[PDB]
Enzyme design. Sequence first.
Site, PDB file in Angstrom:
ATOM      1  CE  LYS A  68      27.115 -14.704 -10.383  1.00  0.00           C
ATOM      2  NZ  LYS A  68      25.705 -14.346 -10.655  1.00  0.00           N
ATOM      3  CD  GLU A 126      31.146 -11.235 -14.470  1.00  0.00           C
ATOM      4  OE1 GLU A 126      30.656 -11.910 -15.394  1.00  0.00           O
ATOM      5  OE2 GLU A 126      30.473 -10.809 -13.515  1.00  0.00           O
ATOM      6  NE  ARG A 127      27.133  -5.262 -14.273  1.00  0.00           N
ATOM      7  CZ  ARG A 127      26.784  -6.335 -13.578  1.00  0.00           C
ATOM      8  NH1 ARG A 127      27.689  -6.990 -12.874  1.00  0.00           N
ATOM      9  NH2 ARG A 127      25.530  -6.751 -13.582  1.00  0.00           N
TER      10      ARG A 127
HETATM   11  N1  LIG Z   1      25.428  -8.733   0.682  1.00  0.00           N
HETATM   12  C1  LIG Z   1      24.388  -7.840   0.073  1.00  0.00           C
HETATM   13  N2  LIG Z   1      23.732  -6.954   0.823  1.00  0.00           N
HETATM   14  C2  LIG Z   1      22.793  -6.145   0.293  1.00  0.00           C
HETATM   15  N3  LIG Z   1      22.479  -6.186  -0.969  1.00  0.00           N
HETATM   16  C3  LIG Z   1      23.088  -7.042  -1.783  1.00  0.00           C
HETATM   17  C4  LIG Z   1      24.102  -7.927  -1.245  1.00  0.00           C
HETATM   18  N4  LIG Z   1      24.530  -8.673  -2.296  1.00  0.00           N
HETATM   19  C5  LIG Z   1      23.844  -8.280  -3.379  1.00  0.00           C
HETATM   20  N5  LIG Z   1      23.039  -7.353  -3.017  1.00  0.00           N
HETATM   21  C6  LIG Z   1      22.147  -6.699  -3.937  1.00  0.00           C
HETATM   22  O1  LIG Z   1      22.092  -7.477  -5.214  1.00  0.00           O
HETATM   23  C7  LIG Z   1      22.665  -6.505  -6.237  1.00  0.00           C
HETATM   24  C8  LIG Z   1      23.521  -7.231  -7.183  1.00  0.00           C
HETATM   25  O2  LIG Z   1      24.828  -7.342  -6.651  1.00  0.00           O
HETATM   26  P1  LIG Z   1      25.942  -8.225  -7.536  1.00  0.00           P
HETATM   27  O3  LIG Z   1      26.873  -8.990  -6.566  1.00  0.00           O
HETATM   28  O4  LIG Z   1      26.783  -7.271  -8.407  1.00  0.00           O
HETATM   29  O5  LIG Z   1      25.109  -9.280  -8.501  1.00  0.00           O
HETATM   30  P2  LIG Z   1      25.754 -10.588  -9.238  1.00  0.00           P
HETATM   31  O6  LIG Z   1      25.205 -11.855  -8.586  1.00  0.00           O
HETATM   32  O7  LIG Z   1      25.395 -10.582 -10.685  1.00  0.00           O
HETATM   33  O8  LIG Z   1      27.242 -10.554  -9.092  1.00  0.00           O
HETATM   34  C9  LIG Z   1      23.436  -5.528  -5.477  1.00  0.00           C
HETATM   35  O9  LIG Z   1      23.495  -4.253  -6.180  1.00  0.00           O
HETATM   36  C10 LIG Z   1      22.680  -5.367  -4.250  1.00  0.00           C
HETATM   37  O10 LIG Z   1      21.563  -4.470  -4.504  1.00  0.00           O
HETATM   38 MG   LIG Z   2      28.678  -9.896 -10.898  1.00  0.00          MG
END
Ligand SMILES: Nc1ncnc2c1ncn2[C@@H]1O[C@H](COP(=O)(O)OP(=O)(O)O)[C@@H](O)[C@H]1O
Ligand SMILES: [Mg+2]
Lengths: 103, 52, 54, 161
Positions: D4, D30-31
Amino acid sequence: LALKTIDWVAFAEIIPQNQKAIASSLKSWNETLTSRLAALPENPPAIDWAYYKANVAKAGLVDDFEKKFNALKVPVPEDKYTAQVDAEEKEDVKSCAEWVSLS
Amino acid sequence: QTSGGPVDASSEYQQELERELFKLKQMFGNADMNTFPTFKFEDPKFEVIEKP
Amino acid sequence: IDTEKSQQALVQKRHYLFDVQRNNIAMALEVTYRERLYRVYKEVKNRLDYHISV
Amino acid sequence: GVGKTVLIMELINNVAKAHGGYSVFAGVGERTREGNDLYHEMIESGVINLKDATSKVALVYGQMNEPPGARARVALTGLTVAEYFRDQEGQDVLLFIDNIFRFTQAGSEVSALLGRIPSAVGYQPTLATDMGTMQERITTTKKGSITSVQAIYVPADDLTD
Ligand SMILES: Nc1ncnc2c1ncn2[C@@H]1O[C@H](COP(=O)(O)OP(=O)(O)O)[C@@H](O)[C@H]1O
Ligand SMILES: [Mg+2]
């Protein structure tokens, strides 16, 4: 707007193999133009000036608009294409009657 | 007593009215809506339908 | 003989191509005319309506 | 951890830089290091200018280290900034909210202490009306536009939550 009703398989039996696409395109445009003449009426609704005489408090702008519109000559497009297809039909009828006498 | 004044002693209500009129005009059109419209017209194309 | 008479029947049916072309020319001109009338009507009414709305 | 924040940062990169109007980022529960990353990345990319008045983004942060009241109202603070930009400026606004679920969650955390009978899954009985009161202000009016991108956390991957 007097159209000639046409059989659509008889139209197909008389099309040589070098203009099948052209026959299909003429057919598609016939159907498109029928549909588009169906989806728009014949004469625009001439709005009464009432809602624009008694609801516009401006100095005659509605009135000069209506004067300029009542006497507008909108260009009626001319045929410029039916005479030559009539000539082509005459030529084709000539050729066809010649071939029929041969037959 | 509003002869000498347009909008009955407002002293305000223009800063937002101009934005409102901008929105209204731009959603009704873009040309000048105080004069009669001049009419550019086009004519349908036509091809060589003659028997090849 | 039958084949020749059938060829003559097709020759008799020939005229629909030019009927189609004439139909399309007439209908295209009518569509253009009516679209032009709707355009002029819509522009006039639209300007009058901008005035009434402001 | 499905992407997300990665997706919303990609949208900030692909839309907000190419955007003509203003932008508001509301970090909600969030963080904090993600907020620091976003701040410094926007400074590097010139979208935030520390020396003159050419900045195009306003940041409002109440993060996951905050008590539930701050986490419940920081989204409203971001809404207020975006609403000013939409109404009094007539601008086209971009509003990114990550994460909006925290809003609801924060309300849950206080709902018991406010003395209310819990609803389904322990949530406040006012979940839907609180969410509606918040979300109906996140809208485009005929006075200005707001394009809104909201990241919505799904607890335990349950979309029926
Ligand atoms: N578009 C992407 N391409 C490659 N890896 C991804 C992508 N989106 C997420 N990831 C992987 O999933 C992990 C979590 O990303 P994040 O967006 O911070 O999670 P959240 O859904 O909690 O926001 C990332 O560190 C990455 O390893
Ligand atoms: Mg997040």
